[PDB]
Design a protein around this ligand. Structure first.
Ligand SMILES: Nc1ncnc2c1ncn2[C@@H]1O[C@H](COP(=O)(O)O)[C@@H](O)[C@H]1O
Ligand SMILES: Nc1ncnc2c1ncn2[C@@H]1O[C@H](COP(=O)(O)O)[C@@H](O)[C@H]1O
Ligand SMILES: [Mg+2]
Length: 258
């Protein structure tokens, strides 16, 4: 079925072992850094939400272990706060940082650049809708992270996972523009499972457009029987957003023809 095909493509499982998955992601990061020794830092945007808090903890753990094993003191995990003006979630971000205990935290306010980009477009004749402005913000955050990685010999870590990939609920070349994604394969509730296992403060991890809830998505990803109308909605989103999960389309591609 289409559901079996999607589960296979995203690598999702009905049940996972929290500690085992924590080690799979950490060993993955450690292995990559040992294979490309010119990489000295992992860069990740921290929003105070579930996904970036989980990815951040895993990144710091990977760096911590690598430092102790190789003795290389130049390795570092860089957490990047990217508020748009004054974020109404700062306290949560502060708690997220206290939980992660990152080596370094850089704060870059993207409001100035976003307003500048909008002024240039406005003068040319293009006014943005709130939705498009949202994607613009996501792309500015990508830019900041890549500039930081470029100056610190690092790579950009993404928070993409099965529950987001299945619906393509990310900005193309925005938060979807990353180098390595250690959470890919996990669904939403499973991400909470890993955070619980890491003793993450409960308040740190506990809509329309996707006429389905995250529980509907997680159940689908776990291979459960869901209402047919729900399955159709999820599958519609999946089919509609294949372009976001593949490189730019060329004359050789045919997936869009079926
Ligand atoms: N306020 C923010 N500060 C830093 N990074 C952010 C922020 N908002 C978005 N991100 C990053 O983008 C990812 C997508 O989350 P979101 O678009 O906020 O639901 C997060 O996992 C973060 O890595
Ligand atoms: N071996 C690698 N694996 C994954 N990402 C990397 C690697 N080498 C470089 N990058 C990323 O790609 C960027 C270089 O691409 P560019 O900006 O087009 O020069 C660096 O700033 C890193 O974020
Ligand atoms: Mg997210």
């Amino acid at each position: 079925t289409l559901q079996q095909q999607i589960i296979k493509a995203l690598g999702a499982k009905p049940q996972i072992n929290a500690e085992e998955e924590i080690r799979r992601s950490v060993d993955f990061l450690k292995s990559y850094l040992q294979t490309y020794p010119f990489i000295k830092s992992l860069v990740l945007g921290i929003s105070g939400g579930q996904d970036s808090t989980l990815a951040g903890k895993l990144c710091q753990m990977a760096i911590n272990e690598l430092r102790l094993e190789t003795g290389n003191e130049s390795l570092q995990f860089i957490a990047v706060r990217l508020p748009y003006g004054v974020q109404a979630d700062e306290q949560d971000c502060q708690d997220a940082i206290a939980f992660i205990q990152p080596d370094r935290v850089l704060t870059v306010n993207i409001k100035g650049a976003v307003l500048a980009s909008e002024q240039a477009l406005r003068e040319a004749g293009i006014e943005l809708s709130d939705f498009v402005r949202g994607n613009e913000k996501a792309r500015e955050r990508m830019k900041a992270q890549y500039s930081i990685a470029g100056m610190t010999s690092g790579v950009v870590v993404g928070t993409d996972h099965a529950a987001e990939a299945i619906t393509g609920f990310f900005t193309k070349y925005g938060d979807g523009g990353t180098d390595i994604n250690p959470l890919y394969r996990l669904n939403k509730r499973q991400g909470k499972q890993l955070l619980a296992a890491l003793a993450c403060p409960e308040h740190l991890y506990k809509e329309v457009a996707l006429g389905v809830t995250y529980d509907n998505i997680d159940d689908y990803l776990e291979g459960k029987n869901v209402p047919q109308q729900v399955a159709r909605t999820i599958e519609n989103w999946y089919l509609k957003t294949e372009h976001k999960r593949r490189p730019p389309i060329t004359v050789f591609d045919d997936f869009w023809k079926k």
